Design a protein around this ligand. Structure first.
Ligand SMILES: N#CC[NH+]1CCN(c2cccc(Cl)c2)CC1
Ligand SMILES: *[C@@H]1O[C@H](CO)[C@@H](O)[C@H](O)[C@H]1NC(C)=O
Length: 342
């Protein structure tokens, strides 16, 4: 059980003006800290955000949040369930800004909603320093889906915040799960991101913004375009046949030749984009998200599990014999890897 703390700075808020927050479970014998960003889509205009507020309100407000949460997967404290980091300080940051963790805009007489994702992450980091994060050796910023994209947008800002605050010994790293998407041609969109950025006052990393320049910041929401501009170490987890990617592409699974070629091409392209990503884990499966699932230990690429690959990554940041860090399936069809989830 991680326990809820609402932010002491009550001007950093969820969409509806209620305070944002985090769930925390400390481990005082550990110098490692895991901060996990929740996912859950986004909204990009007034009518679309009003709809979300009727039927997905916990992703827009803290008024109904529970006081405790169970840590699962990489957030579990049991060695059995979490071989990687079971003894770490665990933090779950709920997603209540609907902005892919990019916003920096307050509710005002001209804004029905607040979009403060990027500022929520900064304020959580600040308040944690008073509860032991000041003694950390490693800060792993992780997240799934919208939270995985949020890792890519925010990991370098957290590193800079800690440097400027006077904590140069904390090593900031990222773990992006199921947030690596392709702006490809559909089988039968990009405009939503572009409109959302203006709606949220969204912020992207500086080096990426300088490359694409004004009006084209939407490009930095795509992993293969923003990742080359990042300085902090980032481990990328991505199913080759991600279900959210296929939903966007209007693919719904007796497959004929046109769809067969389409699906095979998608795998090859995702595969191409990871070839110069040295820390990555990409199985040939139809699925979505993994790192906080209870059975996240089951899947293997080339005989190596995801918890093992992350441990090998830790060792590399101190090639390693028998302990690989770059793991990408080569077979070209969903579930050609026998360890895919069923
Ligand atoms: N966050 C989130 C949930 N969805 C993830 C997939 N998204 C996606 C995938 C491929 C192309 C484009 Cl334009 C968008 C939409 C949002
Ligand atoms: C609270 O957060 C807001 C938004 O980031 C900021 O303007 C303000 O300085 C913060 N207040 C304090 C006391 O840190």
């Amino acid at each position: 059980d991680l326990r809820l703390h609402l932010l002491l700075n009550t001007s950093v808020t969820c969409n509806d003006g209620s305070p944002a927050g985090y769930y925390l479970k400390e481990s005082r014998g550990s110098r490692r800290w895991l901060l996990f960003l929740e996912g859950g889509w986004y909204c990009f205009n007034r009518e679309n955000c009003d709809s979300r507020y009727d039927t997905m309100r916990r992703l827009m407000s803290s008024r109904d949040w529970p006081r405790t949460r169970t840590g699962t997967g990489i957030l579990s404290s049991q060695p059995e369930e979490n071989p990687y980091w079971w003894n770490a300080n665990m933090v779950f940051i709920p997603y209540c800004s609907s902005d892919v963790w990019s916003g920096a805009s307050s509710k005002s007489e001209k804004n029905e909603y607040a979009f403060m994702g990027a500022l929520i992450i900064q304020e959580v980091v600040r308040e944690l320093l008073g509860r032991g994060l000041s003694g950390a050796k490693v800060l792993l910023l992780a997240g799934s889906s919208a939270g995985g994209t949020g890792v890519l947008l925010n990991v370098d800002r957290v590193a800079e915040q800690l440097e400027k605050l006077g904590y140069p010994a904390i090593q900031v790293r990222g773990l992006a799960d199921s947030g690596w998407f392709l702006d490809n041609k559909q089988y039968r969109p990009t405009e939503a991101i572009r409109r959302g950025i203006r709606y949220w006052n969204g912020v992207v990393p500086e080096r990426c913004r300088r490359q694409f320049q004004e009006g084209e910041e939407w490009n930095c929401f795509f992993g293969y375009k923003v990742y080359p501009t990042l300085r902090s170490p980032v481990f990328v987890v991505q199913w080759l046949f991600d279900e959210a990617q296929l939903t966007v592409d209007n693919v719904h699974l007796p497959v004929q030749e046109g769809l067969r070629l389409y699906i095979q091409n998608l795998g090859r392209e995702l595969r191409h984009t990871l070839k110069d990503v040295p820390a990555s884990f990409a199985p040939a499966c139809l699925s979505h998200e993994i790192i906080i699932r209870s059975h996240w230990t089951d899947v293997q690429v080339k005989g190596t599990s995801l918890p093992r690959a992350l441990h090998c990554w830790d060792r590399s940041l101190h090639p390693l014999k028998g302990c690989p860090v770059h793991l990408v399936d080569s077979c070209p069809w969903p579930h050609c890897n026998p360890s895919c989830p069923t």
